[PDB]
Chain length 219, copies 6
């Protein structure tokens, strides 16, 4: 990554053994559960494109997902090149060349080039551009690997309302419902999918009930 030292200048630091192991272990334990994505983003704080490729390449399983991710990255690289074409022909001596899509993705750029860009005044933030493409790709994989439709999450006859609600919002998160839909489902599908006794109590609460209010009512 690039960090500020103890005196305030921006320099390269090697990726740590603790960071490398944290990422490999979270993929082993959680696969593509939705909370893996904010973990990746945090573990890659300050990352160069080289570091981002190291993190992805250290994963041993999930090679169908890693091939889908490559396909997303190539699509974003091709849209960058459409928006930001670069001059062909030789580099001005001692000067920096502009990055192409494959330079952002770390496949045709050196570590020194990447440092040059990220520490320019002002920075050309190649690590953050690439991280956004990767996270776009990862969210597609999360949605693909979500096993269950929200239509099929219904409260069991003896199931505590809290446990049902946990299943419901776990599923909405993996299915990638917008926050608007999440805030709205509370007056609709969450009630419809409740068991008969709780459905009666919720029906009588009326409209405008908060989630806290619904949870206390069916406690």
């Amino acid at each position: 990554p690039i960090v500020q030292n103890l005196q305030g200048q921006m320099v390269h630091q090697c990726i740590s053994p603790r960071t490398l192991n944290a990422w490999v272990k979270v993929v082993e334990e959680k696969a593509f559960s939705p909370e893996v994505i904010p973990m990746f983003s945090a573990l890659s704080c300050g990352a160069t494109p080289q570091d981002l490729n190291t993190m992805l390449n250290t994963v041993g399983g999930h090679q169908a997902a890693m091939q889908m991710l490559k396909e997303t990255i190539n699509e974003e690289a091709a849209e960058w090149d459409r928006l930001h074409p670069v001059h062909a022909g030789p580099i001005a001596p001692g000067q920096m060349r502009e990055p192409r899509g494959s330079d952002i993705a770390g496949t045709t750029s050196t570590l020194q080039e990447q440092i040059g860009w990220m520490t320019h005044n002002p920075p050309i933030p190649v690590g953050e551009i690439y991280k956004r493409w990767i996270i776009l790709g990862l969210n597609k994989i999360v949605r693909m690997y979500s096993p269950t439709s929200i239509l099929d999450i219904r409260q069991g006859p003896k199931e505590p309302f809290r446990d049902y609600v946990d299943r419901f919002y776990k599923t909405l998160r993996a299915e990638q419902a917008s926050q608007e839909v999440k805030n709205a489902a509370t007056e609709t599908l969450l009630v419809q999918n409740a068991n008969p006794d709780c459905k009666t109590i919720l029906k009588a609460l009326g409209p405008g009930a908060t989630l806290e209010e619904m949870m206390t009512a069916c406690q």
Copy 2:
């Protein structure tokens, strides 16, 4: 987080793998037992709003609780906006814009904006404002998930008085009794709920007995 370097200026540092893992593990092991809240506060020392969202988003279960927390955050954001409206229309060039509720909660502000605020002279402490809203939300969840009324904590016939007292104050803490109530319950409900033999001994101690005095008496 924002920290002072080894030379004394306030700068951004990436959240550590050890901090990320500590928080995820404490939620896995303890859920919303009351001691999780002081742990969250300590683990988020110096946090930006970005860091606070990372901590909350890295939690994989408990999605009913995370939706209730969002609802609390939105309520506090809306009260901030009532108290501190911001000018509409374009930013003064090179200057800082004032934060709205959703800027405090990290949803409409960038990391650079958050650093600008927190390191202004004097600071606009957006990380500490947001942390207070989150902890307000978390304490509601603790109270909701408390399984047992203090009325139902009574000493068993062969139960050591110390073990009964531990159950009693564990329950008062989750039910969120004020410290006044905790200090007061010692002359009342703690005695009423004791077994017959200990109740007799405590009755005869009189009023004004400390907890230490009651514990020695029923030892």
Copy 3:
């Protein structure tokens, strides 16, 4: 805590994940065995009152003990206020206000106030004052939770003298005998409580025998 940086000025540092976990784990494994107290003191090196409250609040069980500790803290705070009353009425602008008992205990003082005091020239050592009150409280709890009188530690008929001595001094430590009593018990109760064969050998050694001498004699 407050530490000296790499250049020698006294500044605040966040409490570490390793410190937080060390303390919670030692309470889980050892409860109020006497060696927990020197561990608390060491783990709280350089602590502010805020840090001391964090350590105590992160404990999940033992709520009878934590309520007794609050009672001790309130008693010491009330004696501080008797010895060191503070001026009522408004703060001198930009100047520091004197601490009251509840300011020392971190309940009515801010982190910034606590830093101001501890880094004044010369320091008003609010962290060390509070730590002394806490340790006074903790030693009472250790004595209360000691399960066995020294009168009831007697050597078994086939019990190795070394194992008996370990039981004896483990018990004296929890019962909070002074070092004078510990040094003295060697010529008295340690012999009286020995089994018949070892008691005979120790009787014949005479007075003035060291512990080493008694241990070799009954080996």
Copy 4:
């Protein structure tokens, strides 16, 4: 390794216990699965040739592989010497001598010589030259130890298409197919090797189907 200190000059630092243990453990757990190679590269960030030999020499098993690697290293050293012959006869006093192949591989050069080269202006990057030879060697070993031809990866009759795809691309990676072949196999051998029901569905999708499209189709 060579690192920049907190003030920005390039200096030697000892290899850490955490780095040493990370590498030995990844070889114990994964052997020569393809993801071990990006792990080696990352763990050896900033390495001298001395450090690279330490990492390889700390491996206890896999001595057939370590002998094959020595053979690769000797071949690259001999090609370096063909391209870059060095002057025979005595060193200019106080000056640096040019590196031979065995100097790059750390067998005939001292640590001080290696530091001299790597920190020259501009650097003679002996650590990175050697690391490239080692990784060339390691990729040969990965290919040798790949147990299964891509021809023999076929979808079972009840095997989820995702699990089949994971097996397919895991195998292509160990067999060292180029990225062109990986991107191309999707319109060919991946379909041919599918079970009858999925093969029918994929045949009807037509040409140009992405991997994501094929995975959804056979879900």
Copy 5:
């Protein structure tokens, strides 16, 4: 401990959680096996007397040994006071007072006094003086707790000579034989205590045989 910072002045640093736990765990796993003593010395590198007392006080078992150690410490303190008596009567204002035995042992001196001494030019090395007394005490305990005389270590009839030699020198180390005795026992008691077949072979090797030579002979 006292350490040199990153800029070269001698300052106090808090004892670490890793150091505290390392020591408690080595006593739990090894008790007073002889290799515990070099471990204590290393773990207490740079220690103040306060730190040395913390390490000893964090031990929970072995209270017969900790009482014997106190007795040794008191004997060394009393010999220091015989050699280095201190002036009675009031301290010169702002100046340092000379240490007594109980000041060295940390029982009547403050942390600030101990820092003053250890960082004086030239230092009065109170931490190293106390550590020597402690190690004197610890070596007595090791000798006391050694379970077996060297006379009773004899090679079994099918016991590999190497395993016998390991038992022999493990025992000599706990019994605290001088290095002269260890170097000498090789021509004597090591042969006498060997089984009949190996004794014959060793007898015929003659005098002056190294340990390596004896081990190869009976292999």
Copy 6:
């Protein structure tokens, strides 16, 4: 060890708990397998003679090996004294005295003396001299403890050629064959010791076959 600080001067640092534990654990798990020696060398990067003795003294078993090592060290110390005799009679005031063999081995020199030597301009590298003697000793122990002659490593009738080759080179490494012998054994004893089917195939490959070529042939 001696390290360069963050500002570039050479100073003493205490040996770490992580280094101490790493070494003790590798001896517990691996004993004197050959890969323990490069691990010792790396873990002792920058070591003083004091640190080297700490590492060796913290080992609890293997006391026959530790006595053999002492014997090697004494032999190297005696050859140093033959090559580099020192002046008898008093030290020049404030100046440094020259090291004798037992000063190099840390038995008659202080820590301060060792630092003086290692940080002289130019250094008298007492830590590296001693480490070379120790490693000479350790390699003798590895050879002594090697359980099997290369003559007795022969391929089983159903044993995969790769597994046989791993056994063969594991044994050559412990027996301490030179690299010339290792490179040469491939055209000779490795073939002779192969099973009948593989021996036939290897015989027909001819001379000059690489190890890779032989491994593919018998795959």
